[model samples]
Target: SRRILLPKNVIVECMVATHASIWLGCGHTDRGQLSFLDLNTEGYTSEEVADSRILCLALVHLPVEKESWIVSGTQSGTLLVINTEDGKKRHTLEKMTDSVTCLYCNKNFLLVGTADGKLAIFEDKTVKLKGAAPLKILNIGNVSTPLMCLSESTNVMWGGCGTKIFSFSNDFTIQKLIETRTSQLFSYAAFSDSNIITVVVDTALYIAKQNSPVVEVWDKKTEKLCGLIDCVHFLREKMSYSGRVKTLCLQKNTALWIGTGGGHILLLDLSTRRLIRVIYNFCNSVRVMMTAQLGSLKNVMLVLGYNREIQSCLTVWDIN
Candidate 1:
């Protein structure tokens, strides 16, 4: 676990999860530079390309073609592709006027979610990304929302924009599965067991909403909600303190590793409703908050935060 210092106080996400190496896309301020990180080593050794406003990164692969590409997009609307094997820029797709906020690739197509609230579908015919464009553009309007969540499983896209939760079919059909009056589906995770887990935050409580612990699970196979019992909150009760879950990583043992907005990582035994504290964040304290080292550990999450210029960049904690 490492914090890995980036360019600045900006938006970043663990985009490439290709084991051994985690790729983080560092937002290029207004300068629009293409700077990224390699988290498998000490001290963030990164690669950069000077250009339009940086947006997001994606690891795209074409199994039939025997190729793996690292794709990134920008406010300049340019699409760039890199070869993951050699760590070199392979090709570029000509720019579009609309900014690409998020991207995902299925076995058959590339899905681009733009700032204009459009989900464009592109047929994948991989050769080189030279001046290629989407096969079809669907303007599924929500034009102003920040594109809160987007995840795909089994060739289907699940996303949230404004008040609507939508699912996109490979054949271009969009279904409105769920909608909320005052809440938004912020972060979501897809499971192979046909489960869709989401973190829904209240829009009314904007500040505390970031840490909103409300969770709901769905089973696509059954077309029904699966986890909640009697509208009761089970996970939060196991923790010794009060806080909400911001993002969560599920485990095979029916356990969960949750990351809080306040910079804490909680590991819970879902079967028993027991919680174990694992993180306190970099900038926060140990005694008052809780954390530290020297032991046998398994998996870990690096909690990053900003503080009084001390060792405030990252906190490393292990999760059993």
Candidate 2:
């Protein structure tokens, strides 16, 4: 694994990596900047994308477009669509009902979740122009607790709406799935794509109030809570302390990589539900982690977080 330092004083808040490019949304010089890092040439470029802090980033392919465009959601509810090749703003969407919190995109459409707990689906039909309204909008929660997680599996859309989780159909009908016991507010939640045993991870807000950070495992077939991995207990047993789980990424269906607030990376085996290994001091604190195929490298794991110097940077490594 290797590390790449971003420009000084730039704090990355969200990141997305495609085959040849890495898109990072950062707060630089009191403005929102989008930094493009090229994997093949090892070169990078940065541009100011917004005025407010960018909260989420995604790459989407609009209709009749050859290359994917970079989409950024900001704290002030602005959405900027930038052309990937030229780094020019293609569209400035202003119709989000509230502050944008998360974004997800597929070939067919784009999903935008807002601070007012609204989930809007921008289909390929109407999303090609500026000031376009979403094809469908569903009210998931309220303003105080934003919709933090937006994901999809097998054509079903899953969302983390404050303390309640919901699955929205393609027709836009909603089904109340699972609600967390407390009002901790889920910072992240992911459903396993390949396994019948669906595994999901939910973490508390940054304050780590009353709820303890834990990984909730559910059965895809039954939709029942089959297992739960308490991160606080795990941290105490292995590291002599407790901390919040910062992020999590699943490897295929076998292993799960967990990044914590204390700069540790916990590798867990899914079959046995046991810890595989722990890499201590992996960084000062992990903000985001994902596995992607970069160039010829498969199973490439990229981590974005604060390094030992207290500056945010990216670490690259191959994972099985």
Candidate 3:
């Protein structure tokens, strides 16, 4: 297959999967927009960019049934709920003192973590102001820490702020908090199936289970300290070369992928601790990585978004 470049003048913030793979881009002028790429046809269709600027964060394929719904937060302190299926606005929420830095969607509620340190919750269609706040408004004010990344599992929400990680319950109660020496630049985190939460900080990766001390970190099963892994793709089954790790989707668990800042993609076998394959020498820094299996195709596709100057490229690999 020929390499296809994303449309020029647009910066992709993150990518997700619905019926097909969706790309979300936001920047200074672009409020935010979601594009549907037909993997089979290698064609693209996008709607007019939404309203707002610096929409550096977005979440796609939320707990919604539609294959075209997304929740996007922008620099203008706007939280937009968009329906890509019909290209219509579902809801526009505003309740932050600054830009929306990160967002997470689970079950029926939308969690918006802002740059000003406020964590707001919005139900299916209405915004709740009096409900429990994720972080204390006071702590948010003292530190200019923007909520950068978030992961959701069941009723628990794990959020990353600068070099710190916190856990919030479904009821909006703060459960745990830990500070780290890692820098927050492009860190990404997710909880594994074993309840061990892994975070990529700068060039180091850290793992901790719930109720565990922050200092009790475990080395990757390989013990090879991966330098600057921006995104982690967990698998359900243990790969041949990779150690036991969390799988994003349990139903079709097998192998997993990881995108790093050094412009490499590491494919690991979940069943056995083996390095399946490595695709390298591409982008200078990888910002985001996601996976989607097209239809009943046997192979899963990996998509990556790179940092500045490097045009984003999506690659599909055949998985046995």
Which of candidates 1 and 3 is the stronger one according to lDDT?
1
Q: Report the candidate with higher lDDT, 2 versus 3.
A: 2
Model 1 agreement with the true structure over 97-167: per-residue lDDT tens digits: 57776676565776777766677666666424677777777666555643444654315567655444566
Q: The CA-based lDDT of model 1 is what?
A: 0.50
In candidate 2, what are the lDDT values of residues 213-233, reduced to their tens digit? 565554444555455676766
Cα lDDT listed for each candidate: 0.50, 0.68, 0.49
Which 10-residue window of candidate 2 scores lowest in summed lDDT? Answer: 190-199
> Which residue pairs collide in model 1, if any?
none
TM-score of 1: 0.66
Write down the RMSD of all candidates, one decimal each: 8.3, 5.7, 9.2
**Candidate 1 backbone clash number:** 0
Q: Which segments of candidate 2 are over 4 A away from where they belong? A: 28-30, 40-42, 62-64, 182-211, 219-224, 238-240
What TM-score, to 2 decimals, does candidate 3 have? 0.63
Residue 320 shift from truth in candidate 3, angstroms: 6.1
Output the lDDT of residue 81, model 2.
80
- The predicted structure with the larger TM-score, 2 or 3, is 2
TM-score of each model, in listed order: 0.66, 0.84, 0.63
